[PDB]
Enzyme design. Structure first.
Site, mmCIF file in Angstrom:
data_model
loop_
_atom_site.group_PDB
_atom_site.id
_atom_site.type_symbol
_atom_site.label_atom_id
_atom_site.label_comp_id
_atom_site.label_asym_id
_atom_site.label_seq_id
_atom_site.Cartn_x
_atom_site.Cartn_y
_atom_site.Cartn_z
ATOM 1 C CG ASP A 49 41.149 57.481 51.284
ATOM 2 O OD1 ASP A 49 40.887 56.668 50.402
ATOM 3 O OD2 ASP A 49 42.203 58.153 51.259
ATOM 4 C CD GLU A 88 42.203 54.434 45.746
ATOM 5 O OE1 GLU A 88 42.911 54.454 46.746
ATOM 6 O OE2 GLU A 88 41.884 55.501 45.150
ATOM 7 C CD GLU A 89 44.787 55.303 49.260
ATOM 8 O OE1 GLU A 89 45.439 56.067 48.490
ATOM 9 O OE2 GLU A 89 43.838 55.683 49.972
ATOM 10 C CG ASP A 113 37.671 56.877 47.118
ATOM 11 O OD1 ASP A 113 37.939 56.787 48.326
ATOM 12 O OD2 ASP A 113 38.572 56.761 46.213
ATOM 13 C CG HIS A 117 46.091 60.530 51.206
ATOM 14 N ND1 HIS A 117 46.716 60.318 49.995
ATOM 15 C CD2 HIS A 117 45.026 59.693 51.236
ATOM 16 C CE1 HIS A 117 46.056 59.382 49.327
ATOM 17 N NE2 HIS A 117 45.031 58.990 50.063
HETATM 18 ZN ZN LIG Z 1 43.399 57.674 49.709
#
Ligand SMILES: [Zn+2]
EC number: 2.3.2.5
Length: 323
Positions: free
Chosen positions: A127, A163-164, A210, A292
């Site tokens: 990621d 993106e996060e 992704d 995550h």
């Molecule tokens: Zn992520």
């Protein structure tokens, strides 16, 4: 009033025969990608960090050394965040900038911000360091064929920053780079000099990678307007499998299965999808177990799965571009 923005609706692939498929399988190297494209990205690289700068330089340098005529642009902008105004930088790499149409491959190159915890640092291997490395390996493996582009259609790569979310996902805290770039492209005439068409009309299809790199990924067919392209990925996977060109792979455990996903997943494709761009979202459902977590690292990546997906994606891109 040209109907060129409708060409994408009728575009068909030029399918590779067995000999060509074997050539593509043999032409990509998972160990070369691992050492040269992936490992340099397995670093903390949240927006504004030193690692973000290093990742960006790495990506640019790896594209710059290729023979194909890539045009690199750094799209830098400011945005409000939970921590106040900050700067972000999207990376866009384009072949034939004035070509009216482009097939677009994309992923995010930032890593989610986490304070160091018990001496561990979050590097977001699946990621999305792996997707970044897959795009770089595709550019390298297909370099000779792409050089021939130097059907007003070409290829573009986008590496999104931000993106996060800086905290936990929310509408204003996430997708910084994609919300900004989608808006910029929607308001930029294309081709140069056009009266009523934008760079978004020129986006034939946005293939967003992704969370790739874990074992046994299953990618659902999310959208009806790109379903025929999802079916091509299924066909490519099936034929590469039958030709014995995939590693540790079975059809029962295939990656592209006949199953949709009605829910909505928030990711970089959203700002584009809501502006009418067709999207092929290559994100697995469910997400990797390490999602995550500090365990989203190199050790937990599945090498052969990434190798197999590199082959499938490269075949897909060549067939789309008629190369
Ligand atoms: Zn992520």
């Amino acid at each position: 009033a040209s109907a060129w923005p409708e060409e994408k609706n009728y575009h068909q692939p030029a399918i590779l025969n067995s000999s060509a498929l074997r050539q593509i399988a043999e032409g990509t190297s998972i160990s070369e990608m691992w050492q040269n494209d992936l490992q340099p990205l397995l670093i903390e690289r949240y927006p504004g960090s030193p690692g973000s700068y290093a990742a960006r330089q790495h990506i640019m340098q790896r594209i710059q050394r290729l023979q194909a005529d890539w045009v690199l642009e750094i799209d830098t902008f400011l945005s409000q965040t939970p921590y106040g105004y900050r700067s972000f930088s999207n990376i866009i790499s384009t072949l034939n900038p004035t070509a009216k149409r482009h097939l677009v491959l994309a992923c995010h190159y930032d890593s989610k911000y986490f304070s160091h915890w018990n001496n561990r640092v979050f590097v977001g291997a699946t990621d999305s360091a792996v997707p970044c490395a897959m795009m770089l390996e595709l550019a390298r493996a297909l370099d000779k064929k792409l050089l021939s582009l130097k059907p007003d259609l070409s290829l573009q790569l986008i590496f999104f920053d931000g993106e996060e979310a800086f905290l936990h996902w929310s509408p204003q805290d996430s997708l910084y780079g994609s919300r900004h770039l989608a808006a910029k492209m929607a308001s930029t005439p294309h081709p140069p000099g056009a009266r009523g068409t934008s760079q978004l009309h020129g986006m034939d299809l946005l293939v967003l990678l992704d969370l790739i790199g874990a074992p046994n990924p299953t990618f659902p067919n999310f959208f009806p307007n790109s379903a025929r392209w999802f079916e091509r990925l299924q066909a490519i996977e099936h034929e590469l499998h039958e030709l014995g060109l995939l590693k540790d792979h079975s059809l029962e455990g295939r990656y592209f299965q006949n199953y949709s996903y009605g829910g909505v997943i928030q990711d970089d494709h959203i700002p584009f999808l809501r502006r009418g761009v067709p999207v092929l979202h290559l994100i697995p459902s469910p997400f990797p177990e390490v999602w995550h977590t500090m365990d989203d690292n190199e050790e937990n990546l599945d090498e052969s799965t990434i190798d197999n997906l590199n082959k499938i994606l490269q075949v897909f891109v060549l067939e789309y571009l008629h190369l």
